[PDB]
Amino acid sequence: PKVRDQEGRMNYYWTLVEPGDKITFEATGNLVVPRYAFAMERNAGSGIIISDTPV
Amino acid sequence: GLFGAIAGFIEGGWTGMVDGWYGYHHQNEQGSGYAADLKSTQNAIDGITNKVNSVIEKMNTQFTAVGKEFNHLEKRIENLNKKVDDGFLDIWTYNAELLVLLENERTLDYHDSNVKNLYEKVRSQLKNNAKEIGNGCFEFYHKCDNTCMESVKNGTYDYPKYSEEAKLNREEIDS
Numbered sequence: 359p360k361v362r363d364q365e366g367r368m369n370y371y372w373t374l375v376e377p378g379d380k381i382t383f384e385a386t387g388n389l390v391v392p393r394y395a396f397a398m399e400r401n402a403g404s405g406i407i408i409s410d411t412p413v
Numbered sequence: 414g415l416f417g418a419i420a421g422f423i424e425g426g427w428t429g430m431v432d433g434w435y436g437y438h439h440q441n442e443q444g445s446g447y448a449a450d451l452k453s454t455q456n457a458i459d460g461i462t463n464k465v466n467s468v469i470e471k472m473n474t475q476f477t478a479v480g481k482e483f484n485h486l487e488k489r490i491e492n493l494n495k496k497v498d499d500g501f502l503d504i505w506t507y508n509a510e511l512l513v514l515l516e517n518e519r520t521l522d523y524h525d526s527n528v529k530n531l532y533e534k535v536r537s538q539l540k541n542n543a544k545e546i547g548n549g550c551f552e553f554y555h556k557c558d559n560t561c562m563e564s565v566k567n568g569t570y571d572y573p574k575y576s577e578e579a580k581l582n583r584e585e586i587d588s
């Protein structure tokens with residue numbers, strides 16, 4: 359069924375690559391390749407507040 | 414109250430005593446006035462301050478984000494998370510409400526005990542030299558000037574120094 363004028367669908371995936379590791383993308387079609395990644399260091403705790411209260 | 418002094422055999426408090434929680438009221442030829450017993454008041458302030466700090470400081474928490482997010486097929490764990498949040502709420506609400514109720518009763522009792530003990534200390538000092546006229550008051554059988562008053566409020570009352578003068582006045586008035 360059409361959602362935003364689209365009868366097709368697109369699934370989104372993610373993964374965390376450990377330092378020094380290799381990630382391989384291989385396809386014959388239908389792949390939405392990454393362009394920008396993010397090198398990051400996670401903290402411990404915190405969450406997501408959903409509110410209209412201003413920062 | 415529990416010790417019978419505050420709102421008991423001492424019916425009311427003193428608005429004219431501003432320097433402490435418990436104290437004395439005196440009257441003699443030189444006038445009248447109010448003075449707090451600094452020793453007992455300072456002990457109560459130390460105890461009540463410690464009581465407040467204990468109730469607050471024993472609550473030490475760690476960094477924590479309570480909230481969790483679950484999708485439409487994770488309803489059971491969403492309800493489990495809700496059960497945990499509600500269970501802590503009920504435990505903390507119930508304990509906090511009751512702790513305040515019980516500690517307020519003990520605090521009012523504690524003040525009642527201090528007033529009771531202060532009266533008993535004076536009564537044990539004065540003995541025959543004064544008459545208990547009620548309402549936490551003593552009426553001396555001998556003139557008690559400002560210096561004599563200071564001895565009582567300081568716990569340094571000399572019973573034998575006035576014992577014979579009080580004895581003569583006590584024995585006549587009772588004759």
Ligand SMILES: *[C@@H]1O[C@H](CO)[C@@H](O)[C@H](O)[C@H]1NC(C)=O
Nearest residue numbers: 563564565566567568569570
């Ligand atoms: C009050 O009593 C204390 C008891 O230690 C005594 O040292 C002090 O000298 C007394 N006060 C006066 C003014 O004598």
